[PDB]
Amino acid sequence: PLHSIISSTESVQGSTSKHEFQAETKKLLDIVARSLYSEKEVFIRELISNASDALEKLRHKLVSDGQALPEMEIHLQTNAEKGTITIQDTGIGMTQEELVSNLGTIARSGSKAFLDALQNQAEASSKIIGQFGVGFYSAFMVADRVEVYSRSAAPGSLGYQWLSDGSGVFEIAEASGVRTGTKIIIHLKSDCKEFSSEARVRDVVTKYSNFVSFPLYLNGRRMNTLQAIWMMDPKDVGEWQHEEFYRYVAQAHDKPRYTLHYKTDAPLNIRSIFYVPDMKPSMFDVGSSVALYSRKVLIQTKATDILPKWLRFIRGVVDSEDIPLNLSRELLQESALIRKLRDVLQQRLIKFFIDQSKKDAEKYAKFFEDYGLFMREGIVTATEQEVKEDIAKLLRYESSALPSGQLTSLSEYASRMRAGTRNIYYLCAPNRHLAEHSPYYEAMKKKDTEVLFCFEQFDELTLLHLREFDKKKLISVETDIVVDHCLSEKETEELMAWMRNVLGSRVTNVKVTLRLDTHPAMVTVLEMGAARHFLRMQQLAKTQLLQPTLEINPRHALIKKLNQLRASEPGLAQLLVDQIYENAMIAAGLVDDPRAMVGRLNELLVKALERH
Amino acid sequence: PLHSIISSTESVQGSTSKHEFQAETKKLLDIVARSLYSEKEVFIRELISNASDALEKLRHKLVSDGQALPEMEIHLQTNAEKGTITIQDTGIGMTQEELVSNLGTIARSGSKAFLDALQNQAEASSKIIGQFGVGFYSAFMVADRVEVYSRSAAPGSLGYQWLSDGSGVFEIAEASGVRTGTKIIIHLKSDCKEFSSEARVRDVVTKYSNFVSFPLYLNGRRMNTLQAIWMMDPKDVGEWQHEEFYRYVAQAHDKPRYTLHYKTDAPLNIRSIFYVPDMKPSMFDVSRSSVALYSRKVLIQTKATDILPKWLRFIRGVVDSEDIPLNLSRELLQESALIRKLRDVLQQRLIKFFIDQSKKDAEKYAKFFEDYGLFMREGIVTATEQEVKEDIAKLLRYESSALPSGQLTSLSEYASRMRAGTRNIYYLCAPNRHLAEHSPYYEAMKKKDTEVLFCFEQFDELTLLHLREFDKKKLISVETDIVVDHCLSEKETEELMAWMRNVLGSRVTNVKVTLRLDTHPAMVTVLEMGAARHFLRMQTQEERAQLLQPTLEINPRHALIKKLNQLRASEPGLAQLLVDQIYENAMIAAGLVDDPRAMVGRLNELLVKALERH
Amino acid sequence: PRIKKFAIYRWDPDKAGDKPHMQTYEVDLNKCGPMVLDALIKIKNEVDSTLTFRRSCREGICGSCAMNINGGNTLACTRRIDTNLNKVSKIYPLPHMYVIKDLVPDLSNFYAQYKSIEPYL
Numbered sequence A: 001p002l003h004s005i006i007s008s009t010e011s012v013q014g015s016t017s018k019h020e021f022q023a024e025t026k027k028l029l030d031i032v033a034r035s036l037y038s039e040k041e042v043f044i045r046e047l048i049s050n051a052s053d054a055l056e057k058l059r060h061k062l063v064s065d066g067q068a069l070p071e072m073e074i075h076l077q078t079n080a081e082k083g084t085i086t087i088q089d090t091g092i093g094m095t096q097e098e099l100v101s102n103l104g105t106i107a108r109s110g111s112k113a114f115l116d117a118l119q120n121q122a123e124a125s126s127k128i129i130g131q132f133g134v135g136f137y138s139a140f141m142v143a144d145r146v147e148v149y150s151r152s153a154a155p156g157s158l159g160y161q162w163l164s165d166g167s168g169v170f171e172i173a174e175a176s177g178v179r180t181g182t183k184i185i186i187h188l189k190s191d192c193k194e195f196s197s198e199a200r201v202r203d204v205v206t207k208y209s210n211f212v213s214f215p216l217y218l219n220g221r222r223m224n225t226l227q228a229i230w231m232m233d234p235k236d237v238g239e240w241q242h243e244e245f246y247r248y249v250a251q252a253h254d255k256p257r258y259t260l261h262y263k264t265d266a267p268l269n270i271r272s273i274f275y276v277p278d279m280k281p282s283m284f285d286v287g288s289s290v291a292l293y294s295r296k297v298l299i300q301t302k303a304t305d306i307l308p309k310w311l312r313f314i315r316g317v318v319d320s321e322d323i324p325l326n327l328s329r330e331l332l333q334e335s336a337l338i339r340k341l342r343d344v345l346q347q348r349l350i351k352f353f354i355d356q357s358k359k360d361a362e363k364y365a366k367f368f369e370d371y372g373l374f375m376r377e378g379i380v381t382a383t384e385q386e387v388k389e390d391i392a393k394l395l396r397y398e399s400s401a402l403p404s405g406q407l408t409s410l411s412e413y414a415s416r417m418r419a420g421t422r423n424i425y426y427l428c429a430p431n432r433h434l435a436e437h438s439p440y441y442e443a444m445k446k447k448d449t450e451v452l453f454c455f456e457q458f459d460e461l462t463l464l465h466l467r468e469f470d471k472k473k474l475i476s477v478e479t480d481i482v483v484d485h486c487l488s489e490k491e492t493e494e495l496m497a498w499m500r501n502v503l504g505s506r507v508t509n510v511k512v513t514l515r516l517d518t519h520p521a522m523v524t525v526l527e528m529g530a531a532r533h534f535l536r537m538q539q540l541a542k543t544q545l546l547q548p549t550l551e552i553n554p555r556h557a558l559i560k561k562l563n564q565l566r567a568s569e570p571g572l573a574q575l576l577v578d579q580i581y582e583n584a585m586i587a588a589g590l591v592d593d594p595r596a597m598v599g600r601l602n603e604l605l606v607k608a609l610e611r612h
Numbered sequence B: 001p002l003h004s005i006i007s008s009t010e011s012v013q014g015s016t017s018k019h020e021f022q023a024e025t026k027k028l029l030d031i032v033a034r035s036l037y038s039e040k041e042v043f044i045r046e047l048i049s050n051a052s053d054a055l056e057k058l059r060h061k062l063v064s065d066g067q068a069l070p071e072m073e074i075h076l077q078t079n080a081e082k083g084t085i086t087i088q089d090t091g092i093g094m095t096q097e098e099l100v101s102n103l104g105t106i107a108r109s110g111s112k113a114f115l116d117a118l119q120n121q122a123e124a125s126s127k128i129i130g131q132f133g134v135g136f137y138s139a140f141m142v143a144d145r146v147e148v149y150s151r152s153a154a155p156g157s158l159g160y161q162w163l164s165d166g167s168g169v170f171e172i173a174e175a176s177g178v179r180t181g182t183k184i185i186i187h188l189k190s191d192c193k194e195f196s197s198e199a200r201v202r203d204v205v206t207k208y209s210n211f212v213s214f215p216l217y218l219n220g221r222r223m224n225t226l227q228a229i230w231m232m233d234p235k236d237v238g239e240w241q242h243e244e245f246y247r248y249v250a251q252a253h254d255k256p257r258y259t260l261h262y263k264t265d266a267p268l269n270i271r272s273i274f275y276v277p278d279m280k281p282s283m284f285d286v287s288r289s290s291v292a293l294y295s296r297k298v299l300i301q302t303k304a305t306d307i308l309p310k311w312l313r314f315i316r317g318v319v320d321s322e323d324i325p326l327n328l329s330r331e332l333l334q335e336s337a338l339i340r341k342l343r344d345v346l347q348q349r350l351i352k353f354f355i356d357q358s359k360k361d362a363e364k365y366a367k368f369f370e371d372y373g374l375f376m377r378e379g380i381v382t383a384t385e386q387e388v389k390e391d392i393a394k395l396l397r398y399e400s401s402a403l404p405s406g407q408l409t410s411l412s413e414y415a416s417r418m419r420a421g422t423r424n425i426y427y428l429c430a431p432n433r434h435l436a437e438h439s440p441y442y443e444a445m446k447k448k449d450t451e452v453l454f455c456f457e458q459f460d461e462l463t464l465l466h467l468r469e470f471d472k473k474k475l476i477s478v479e480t481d482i483v484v485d486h487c488l489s490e491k492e493t494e495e496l497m498a499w500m501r502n503v504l505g506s507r508v509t510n511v512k513v514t515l516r517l518d519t520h521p522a523m524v525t526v527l528e529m530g531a532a533r534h535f536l537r538m539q540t541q542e543e544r545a546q547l548l549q550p551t552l553e554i555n556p557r558h559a560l561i562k563k564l565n566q567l568r569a570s571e572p573g574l575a576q577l578l579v580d581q582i583y584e585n586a587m588i589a590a591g592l593v594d595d596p597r598a599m600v601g602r603l604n605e606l607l608v609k610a611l612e613r614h
Numbered sequence C: 001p002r003i004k005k006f007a008i009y010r011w012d013p014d015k016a017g018d019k020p021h022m023q024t025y026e027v028d029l030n031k032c033g034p035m036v037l038d039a040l041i042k043i044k045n046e047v048d049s050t051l052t053f054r055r056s057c058r059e060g061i062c063g064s065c066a067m068n069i070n071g072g073n074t075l076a077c078t079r080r081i082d083t084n085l086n087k088v089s090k091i092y093p094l095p096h097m098y099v100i101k102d103l104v105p106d107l108s109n110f111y112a113q114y115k116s117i118e119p120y121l
Ligand SMILES: Nc1ncnc2c1ncn2[C@@H]1O[C@H](COP(=O)(O)OP(=O)(O)NP(=O)(O)O)[C@@H](O)[C@H]1O
Pocket: A046, A049, A050, A051, A053, A054, A089, A091, A092, A093, A094, A102, A103, A108, A109, A110, A111, A112, A129, A130, A131, A132, A133, A134, A135, A136, A137, A181, A182
């Protein structure tokens, strides 16, 4: 039965008191320094974000006052001998009251207070990074003691010295000689001294915040040298620094063949740029260096996959000021905003590829034979139908009604197709030479219906999964043949009975089709593409057969030879019919590893040539 | 361009002050309820963890004085009509002071004080989940009003009331009729009404808290019905329990073919159990870890850290560890030394277990290998250190020529039983054992008196090249060995070879004469045959010949070559067709054909124009 | 003075943005072994150790010294170095045979391929 202990018999009689929520700071500091950030290296990223926020606040205050703008930059100092790292900025700075209010209070951020005093939410809201109030305390992950020398930008503010050992207690004092801005001294821990090295600090800074809006100097050397080109207008930015930005983000030295600059705000604020490499994709590729940004700082999700898996051949950067973030400055897993951003990016990239195909046939064709497998994988892995047709609009195939060297899409293929026809025919062969001479094409050559020729692998599976385009079905040539509704009748009956006797285990059914002229034999099955690809699966890996039907050509000379050669050499006749079956299986693509057929072919060749 | 503004001119000029850290409670609540947990359904997981902690505390308190133990169960109540979910537990409960100190303070947990007051750290330290102090406030993610009925288990405590809307202000009061323990009523938000349904709550509890230490009741009916069998000793758990647990964890109706119960504490506290499915692996198994973490008997839900190596994803089970570092979101801390050492320990333990299973039984391990070989192949391919390479390679089973058909042999025993004076291991790739025994490369190698392994599955030679070494013995394929190692009349052979090279100058870069072949008229040899075969699958005929150099190597003693010797003059066209056909056959025997459909037409032409004289 | 010009193919997987590029190496023939393998070892210990090659017995028995020269696959520890001053040796790896041995193919999205198979069957 049901055993429930929930009851409503309880009642309230006592006076209702009132209390304010408390928060002990010892455990909060312990949580921030130990169980908040997975990476120990994010503390300088947080400090650089704080410096950028301070510089932005100073810039906003100065432009509000409308006076001269002094130099503003972020300086990083590394001292291996002292085991310390120093970050200094020329921002607004903090008074003693400001230092106590901000530094001494957990989750209290002056950035949010400054943003609440903007009244426009566009001048600096897009550039202020701080939103939680725990970014500074990430520095206690590596520092046994922190010295902060901050002097406010107000004309007359005094410098102040800030000490904190990270043990829940901090002290402040008056400081003399402190320049305008904020100077932070970090004394590294015994086990975290790797941050007192120039190389590691430079690498991690370039990883996190090399796109900080203000100049950044480490040990006196600036390493930015490159503005965030995804913020500026596409017309302002030129192709030369597009190439430079591509060479930096993709860690390559080639040029991007395609450059898409996406900047929309109505659905959600996106400032993203995408590139397509000139060189063919490497097998390593087969977050794809499209790591998400927010207010010009790295997020390194690698789990939400802001960009579709098949769209991993493109390189670039995506920026969004409204993405939700963890307390550790990481994306919220399985967030609705993330999913809608991914969908919008995929739709925009599909539209951009369609436009590129429309405006450049030859360049897009080269791109397709360079990156077709990615679109094939996207069609295979897709679930929504409209996504399937959107990706299929990017497919390029060459039909039988056109000369070699030019390719066409499914849309313009169906545009020129007859009104009565309501299905699309496609044939699969390694080359167009084989496709034109393929027995299935010859069998279907009776009608004038156009047929597409696809050569690359996984085309069978891609077309099978698509299964529809513009309300038109995709039927393979073999499927059309199987669903379709000199060797006299008696000798032909006896001869197919011969195959049925000698190929009963392999060939389940033998029949004669009058639609063959050059190929002596044909193998047709209902699930031709599915069976062909599943056989490749099975032979590739032993994991979790089929119903083959062989059709002979009555008018073929090779088949006609069996009539006179059966009575002379029964064994040679059996070997020849076995070889014919193997050749038909190979042509159908349903054959297994053909190393076994080699011995039979050699034996047949040596045995059947004792006449010259 | 080297300028810096860093200087040590700063110094203290006044008397130093002293201050204590503060905390903005409103912003902390907003952060916890808005930007802490990725999934909005973790609030009931946190509440169930709190209930389990309270029940464990009550159990410890009642065992310390050795008195009677009353019922201990966690009840989930769903009220769709009122849009509320009620959690009730019969644990210790909380007094007014305890309610104010614990509930009213952020990041303040009474479990830490309870753990510090154990004085043993050996009985309840492994059964207490709460360690941060923010788990309760996760309820504010979906609740606009949280109502708590709590009274302590002390003899004479009074019921108390606890209301809070999550806006940083909570009001306390005194309640009557409250059962001993703690009952929390959550009033769902307008958009979070999905948690006021049976199905959603059942799904989340089955996701997170099936294996809580105490019985759990959802809407009056118990829904656990399955104890965590990875806690006690392997001798205390039966085979039926193992089968049921495997069925639950793998979501399959079969039985586990292999059962491993790992419980180690010297490197780190691990209580892990692993199963190998009896059925063959599915395509979901070969596509990306099928192992669920459980810290203090609650799910961690990593799904991305891959606590187990990618090649070992074919096994199903759970791993318990009380030492793994969890972030504030109760998720695994990515890039952790402890989790990396846990992964290494699990990998080496599973390798040792598989080796021990292979030693114990032969037919069962042979079936396991022929079922899950591709996983070990992928592990060999993806490994970097040679130690793990050899450890995984110890699991390989390849039948050799020195043994009859259907007798798989290991690499270690092959190295042990071969010559000690040569550091060479020879392997041959063929679709079948019969083909390997009649392969032209094997026949050419027959001059040497040595044992050769046979490979049949795909991506096998690829792993042989990745391994590249085993017990300080090099791995060399038969084709590579023979190409590295150095009838018809002489002049007739020379003119025949000249004619073939004339008609195969572009396709074949070199042709030689080899007497080792006996039943194969020709053989294509490439120096890196194993690498070339796999390279072909990723990258018409002229380009392939240029990037492969199919060095032909024919056998004059073959009857086909003898027949071609006289067919070169009578039928030059048929001779050209036949030399093309034998080149294609040798290429196929080498496995250097991307698609054999092209040769079908010319083979048919050869057949129709060759045996027409019959 | 017999300065030999060697044109050696180089590709470092760990290099940032490495692309196929051509380099020329000059080694005196008066102080170097006639065999091709000696020149490779000479630059490894003296000129540049970045180039990686496999050699065990410097005699022609293990086969690790086999690469392609002038579009032809040969053996470095058997074939000697050409003495022509004007002619430059074309030191290339095996015809293509790139880092594929260490590319570690993933072959992901394999289940989704099966998921597209059973609707037809
Ligand atoms: N270098 C600095 N100069 C001036 N003000 C600073 C500086 N560093 C920190 N602050 C102030 O101190 C506050 C506390 O720092 P922090 O913890 O980073 O909050 P936040 O950056 O605004 N939010 P978060 O995203 O968690 O970092 C900031 O919000 C600033 O108002």
